[PDB]
Amino acid sequence: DGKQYTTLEKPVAGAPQVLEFFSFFCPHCYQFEEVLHISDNVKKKLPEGVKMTKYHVNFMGGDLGKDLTQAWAVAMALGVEDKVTVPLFEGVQKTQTIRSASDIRDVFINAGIKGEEYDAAWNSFVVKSLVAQQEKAAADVQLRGVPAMFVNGKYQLNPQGMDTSNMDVFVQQYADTVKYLSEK
Ligand SMILES: C[C@H](CCC(=O)NCCS(=O)(=O)O)[C@H]1CC[C@H]2[C@@H]3[C@H](O)C[C@@H]4C[C@H](O)CC[C@]4(C)[C@H]3C[C@H](O)[C@]12C
């Protein structure tokens, strides 16, 4: 109990069944996703049909981070989030070329989203709604750190209890825990 997850006292309404919070500015999130590939390994183990979604957070990267949350909404709106995840992480943390909102847009353009399509999405209702969802879900759990993962809007993963002597075992322990939780 509490070893691999905790139960929220107030469940999150409208949350993706498997919800990962992250920041492109967060080095740990980069380790979590681009080295451990947690979400990929979780997805492989999830029951068929279960939605896993990543939500961006606003509390890193200054006001640019908030723009990135909106760009991430654009990505989800356009269905390119999986693709742009890598160049956004790399642009922020590796090449350090994401220093303004136009640099974010450039990543999308280079990923094949025309500037005009990005801008129209940026200003669209679907994007505003996705931004509202990301911000509301973070508020609903009083999120103070990333990465974090929540299942069924009810269960918060606790990686602290998990054995880290072997990264492969850690990843599968974590993925197994998510699957178990998703089936509750
Ligand atoms: C920064 C993360 C915790 C952030 C946080 O406080 N989130 C909210 C609370 S909770 O978590 O959701 O409960 C921690 C949790 C698990 C950690 C990871 C795991 O320990 C597995 C490896 C261990 C390696 O030594 C470093 C990379 C890493 C991939 C760790 C990076 C970072 O320290 C993580 C990602």
Residue numbers in the entry: 5 to 188
Text from the published report:
To identify the structural details of the interaction between TC and DsbA, we solved the crystal structures of TC in complex with oxidized EcDsbA and VcDsbA using molecular replacement at resolutions of 1.79 Å and 1.74 Å, respectively. In the complex with EcDsbA, TC occupies the full length of the hydrophobic groove and buries 435 Å2 of solvent accessible surface area (SASA). It interacts with H32 in the active site and cis‐P151, both of which are highly conserved in DsbA enzymes and critical for disulfide catalysis. The interaction with the steroid core at the right‐hand side of the groove (proximal to the active site) is driven by hydrophobic interactions with F36, L40, M171, F174, P163 and L161. On the left‐hand side (distal to the active site), the negatively charged sulfonate group of TC forms a network of polar interactions with the side chain amide of Q160 and a series of water molecules, and its amide NH forms a hydrogen bond with the backbone amide of cis‐P151. Additional polar contacts are made to a symmetry related EcDsbA molecule through the amide carbonyl and hydroxyl groups of TC which point away from the hydrophobic groove, however no hydrophobic interactions are made to the symmetry related EcDsbA molecule and the solution HSQC NMR data are consistent with the binding mode determined by X‐ray crystallography with significant CSP located in the hydrophobic groove. The side chains of F174, T168 and M171in EcDsbA are oriented towards the active site, which narrows the right‐hand side of the hydrophobic groove forming a small hydrophobic pocket around TC, pushing TC further towards the left‐hand end of the groove where additional interactions are formed. The VcDsbA‐TC interface consists of three direct polar interactions to the backbone amide of Gly161 and the side chains of His32 and Tyr170, whereas the EcDsbA‐TC interface has two direct polar interactions to the backbone of Pro151 and the side chain of Gln160. Comparison of the crystal structure of TC bound to EcDsbA with previously reported co‐structures of EcDsbA in complex with diaryl ether 3 shows the steroid core of TC makes similar hydrophobic interactions to diaryl ether 3 in the hydrophobic groove.
DsbA enzymes catalyze oxidative folding of proteins that are secreted into the periplasm of Gram‐negative bacteria, and they are indispensable for the virulence of human pathogens such as Vibrio cholerae and Escherichia coli. DsbA enzymes retain a conserved tertiary structure, comprising a classical thioredoxin (TRX) domain with an inserted α‐helical domain. The TRX domain contains a pair of redox‐active cysteine residues in a CXXC motif located adjacent to a conserved cis‐proline residue. These features contribute to a hydrophobic patch of residues located in a surface groove of DsbA that is required for substrate recognition.
